[PDB]
Ligand binder design. Sequence first.
Ligand SMILES: *[C@@H]1O[C@H](CO)[C@@H](O[C@@H]2O[C@H](CO)[C@@H](O)[C@H](O)[C@H]2NC(C)=O)[C@H](O)[C@H]1NC(C)=O
Ligand SMILES: *[C@@H]1O[C@H](CO)[C@@H](O[C@@H]2O[C@H](CO)[C@@H](O)[C@H](O)[C@H]2NC(C)=O)[C@H](O)[C@H]1NC(C)=O
Ligand SMILES: *[C@@H]1O[C@H](CO)[C@@H](O)[C@H](O)[C@H]1NC(C)=O
Ligand SMILES: *[C@@H]1O[C@H](CO)[C@@H](O)[C@H](O)[C@H]1NC(C)=O
Lengths: 39, 136, 154, 867
Amino acid sequence: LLTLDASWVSSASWYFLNVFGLRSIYSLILGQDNAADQS
Amino acid sequence: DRFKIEGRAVVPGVKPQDWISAARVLVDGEEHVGFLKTDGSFVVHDIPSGSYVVEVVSPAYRFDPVRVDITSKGKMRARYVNYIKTSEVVRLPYPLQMKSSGPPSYFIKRESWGWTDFLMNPMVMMMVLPLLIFVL
Amino acid sequence: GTVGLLLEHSFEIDDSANFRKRGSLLWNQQDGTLSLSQRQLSEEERGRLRDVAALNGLYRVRIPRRPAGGYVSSFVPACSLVESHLSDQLTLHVDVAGNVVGVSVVTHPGGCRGHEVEDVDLELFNTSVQLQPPTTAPGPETAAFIERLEMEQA
Amino acid sequence: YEDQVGKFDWRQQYVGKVKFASLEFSPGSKKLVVATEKNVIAALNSRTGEILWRHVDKGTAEGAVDAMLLHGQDVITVSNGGRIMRSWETNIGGLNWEITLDSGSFQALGLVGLQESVRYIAVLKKTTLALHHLSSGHLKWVEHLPESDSIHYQMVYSYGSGVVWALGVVPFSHVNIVKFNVEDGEIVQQVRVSTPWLQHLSGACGVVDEAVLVCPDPSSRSLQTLALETEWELRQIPLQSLDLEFGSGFQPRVLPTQPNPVDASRAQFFLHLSPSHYALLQYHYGTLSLLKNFPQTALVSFATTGEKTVAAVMACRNEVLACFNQTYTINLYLVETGRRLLDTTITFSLEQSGTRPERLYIQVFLKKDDSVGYRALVQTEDHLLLFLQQLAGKVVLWSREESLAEVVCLEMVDLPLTDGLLGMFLKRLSSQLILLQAWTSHLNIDTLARDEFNLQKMMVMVTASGKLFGIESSSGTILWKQYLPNVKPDSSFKLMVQRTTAHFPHPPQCTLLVKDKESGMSSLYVFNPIFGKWSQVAPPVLKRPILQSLLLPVMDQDYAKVLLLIDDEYKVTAFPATRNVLRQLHELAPSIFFYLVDAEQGRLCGYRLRKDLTTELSWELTIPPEVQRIVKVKGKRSSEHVHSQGRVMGDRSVLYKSLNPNLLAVVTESTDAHHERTFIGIFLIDGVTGRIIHSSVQKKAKGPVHIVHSENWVVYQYWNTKARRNEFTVLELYEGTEQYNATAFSSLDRPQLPQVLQQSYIFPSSISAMEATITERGITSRHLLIGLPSGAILSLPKALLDPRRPEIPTEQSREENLIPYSPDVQIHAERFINYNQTVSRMRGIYTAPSGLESTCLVVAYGLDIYQ
Ligand SMILES: *[C@@H]1O[C@H](CO)[C@@H](O[C@@H]2O[C@H](CO)[C@@H](O)[C@H](O)[C@H]2NC(C)=O)[C@H](O)[C@H]1NC(C)=O
Ligand SMILES: *[C@@H]1O[C@H](CO)[C@@H](O[C@@H]2O[C@H](CO)[C@@H](O)[C@H](O)[C@H]2NC(C)=O)[C@H](O)[C@H]1NC(C)=O
Ligand SMILES: *[C@@H]1O[C@H](CO)[C@@H](O)[C@H](O)[C@H]1NC(C)=O
Ligand SMILES: *[C@@H]1O[C@H](CO)[C@@H](O)[C@H](O)[C@H]1NC(C)=O
């Protein structure tokens, strides 16, 4: 698409947002200062 | 005054009796039409002087169009069509031997990418180069 | 050489057709120039245009089709005509054979913003007159393509 | 493509109304050879009614079938008014020989025999007769019949005698007959007789028994006869002696037979005395006898099983003219004796109303018990083919709707749908329990429902035969059929969707606007577009001829879109034209403008809409017909949207498109047809103020021109006579870098003439139909559905046809990713939306937005119809 709104996202960036937003959850459930992150 | 364009059309490996049933020869974009006889040859009648693109239209096997220049006097010639640089002449014998080039390719094959295609991802490289910069 | 074309205008409270002679168009076919010789508006015409402007009416122009074989006409919001200080442009469209096709009138600037206009402004006919012959469309460019592909091949 | 054939698409092959048919074939051959009014020669499967080999021809009259004959296994046809004669092999499905003929209007075609076998063809034109060989089509001999400059020849006869009978007449005067010999062709004999009462020979006269000429004379209520073998003077026999009479204001006919050309005709023959009346007469040496009289019988037919002749007679079960119920029975009568056959009666019923059978061709064979078993192909009045088989089960074998060959207009109709907070919570929780129960419980036009994606619509099709169809857009089946009585072939139609299916309390409603060309009177038919039945809302009677119609987006209370018509007196008629409707459109009157394009005078007029339902001359332009005739008035589709108002030009800047919603694209041709002086003009006349935005004229070009008008751009394909090549020319309308009037667009408030970008491309093939791909929101890229004569549907991307493609790539172009300008447009076979489903003689391409945003529904209509 060319005129598509920028607010529409493909799979890769959605996965990136998912992986960005889950570190806090990891610390919440797994335990404090878990090693699953991205630095 | 009125002339006829003769020719033939054969598809390699397929008898005419199998494909001529639904094939038409078109002289200058449906402005003149003709039908191939049993043997595979074709004849188009009632053609005035000028230039005409002859194409054997057949859904089974495509045919290369050929330009034919017929004059008022009666002499007439065949050549390869070229809508760009139309002044050129590439002679082709008049009894058009438009052999087919096999069935056309209306369909497009599935992608079916393999792991070897996944190996060299431009996105992966372009996003791992900053990873190496961050490490160093 | 030169042909004179009548040009009538009309504007009424009821927005009907009351075309009246306004100006003569001198179309010189040789050099392709058109010149108009109009009379300035009068008080009643100015007044009539005022109510037409007040009621958001239309200002219609009409010329004979040939130098009484017909007419080609158009219209323009007279209130937009009066809110533009009587500044407009009329384009005369003809065909390839040199026959009148149409007349298009448009003010400058267009539209309206509720600008009150005094009477003294309407004593001049700021009119830009143009003639528009049919513009020949360009054909496909082949010479550039063949030469460019020749350079690519070599 | 993607090799998912048949998953979503469907094609139906339709031939036109069956002008000439041939049923005589081997019982195992199971073939019908039919030539239709659509210039199509096809073979139909006898068992199921399907195409075996179909050969379409030129759409114009220059390939019209004029006469068909069958011999053995190859069918012989004449086309172009006797100019070409061809022999088609019915088995293979191809030609056997194609021969051009000389000038002269063809009048009669026949075969000849030497002694026992037919081997040559006698074809007669108004001034000459010609013989052609069966084996190769080589011309045998041509003879100019004497005195033919005055006489008009009407029939040709020959048989095993090795001679040729030629007959000509002069209206209300004497007639002449010539005897030729098949061996040479010289005039063996020539006679003349006086027929003062005779009008014409083919329609009225006939020839039975041993070449005995029989002209029915209604002046004296008699049967003038001439024993043409020996008699030189006509003889007369009144029908009163045979207890027969002719009708009033009707031309009686005589139907002979000839089982094979070599043998003489059967003595018995039919006589059409009066409509719904026939007689069987057996001529025997100067006298005739009535074999059987068939009253109140519509159609009769003859057949031969090899030795005996069989007559099929058609009549309804009980007459009520017309017929009680469309139940027609066909009975077999022996021709040797006028006796009805036993256990051969067939009975069928026509589904439509107001339609009566028109053509009947029967094919006979010997049953196991030597009983004559026959089948009947009957074409109704509304261009419908029925195949009837003798056995009671499935009295119709294959019903073919050939009428759909010529579709005028079609539309796609969506399928029908499948204060206190405490009350709100109560109903919401109740709904929750209802849904839970429905989920836990999980442990055809009757049930028609809209799809989830709205991808399955229903097509309402209009056919110039005056027939309305409802075809499921997914499977291609027909859901409802309706007929409009008394619809002329040249009538102009207009179909409008007044109310869709999104108003469940209200029935869906569509309006079709037909206009007879000859009379000029137009009528409105309102029907449910889902079920097909006429709505009970009586449409208004359009007394005056109308000129144009508008579908205003304003809707009535029942969500019916207001429709406006402009009559001949330039008045406006509304529909439903209620008080609310009248008030709404009277209050919104000055914002409604009509434009009428009189192509005959080359005039364009634009009218206002007054408060009191009257029109006034707002603007008027005249393109002189003496140098230019208007050929296309393509305006932009009203039901489209534009997503990006402007476009990114790179540079971090934007270029604004010239979105004028009232922009006509009138395309006119040059009345000068010379190959060197022809031109095609395109004017971007405004629809409201009448201003010509652009007045381009391409020189040295000729039609036909296929133009698509879209959101902003227009693309018109044309022929280039100078270079002999189809060429495109894309016109894109662009505003300045900043928009003039944003909030809203008014055609009266555009003093800035939009800039035009032009580019001419070369198309390496012809064209038959074009239409841009349309999406709901216009987000999806635009594609042109190029209709090639071959039948394919090229999907050309609009981004390719950009006029801004530079001739030399630059950094700006690379930033904008503009391809360098290439005058050649490819026709890559991979772009076709159809693989081999070619649509022969393509007429139009309809594109529907459908649901979603990436899928556009496509219906290519022409001879075949494909979706
Ligand atoms: C008539 O009115 C127009 C509009 O006001 C005048 O055009 C303007 O001309 C000045 C220069 O003199 C430009 O700066 C403006 O941008 C123009 N405005 C436009 C084009 O809308 C015009 O000069 C006036 N007179 C004549 C004789 O045409
Ligand atoms: C010709 O048209 C037919 C009908 O649309 C296509 O259908 C089938 O396609 C598959 C593809 O694998 C073939 O295996 C079948 O034999 C086809 N059935 C037929 C021809 O009856 C077919 O693919 C089309 N052929 C081409 C070359 O486009
Ligand atoms: C004729 O009778 C049949 C059987 O009752 C019925 O279905 C049909 O609608 C009737 N009318 C017509 C015009 O076919
Ligand atoms: C457009 O024109 C109207 C007058 O026709 C004016 O009121 C308005 O401000 C202009 N601009 C926009 C963005 O609407």
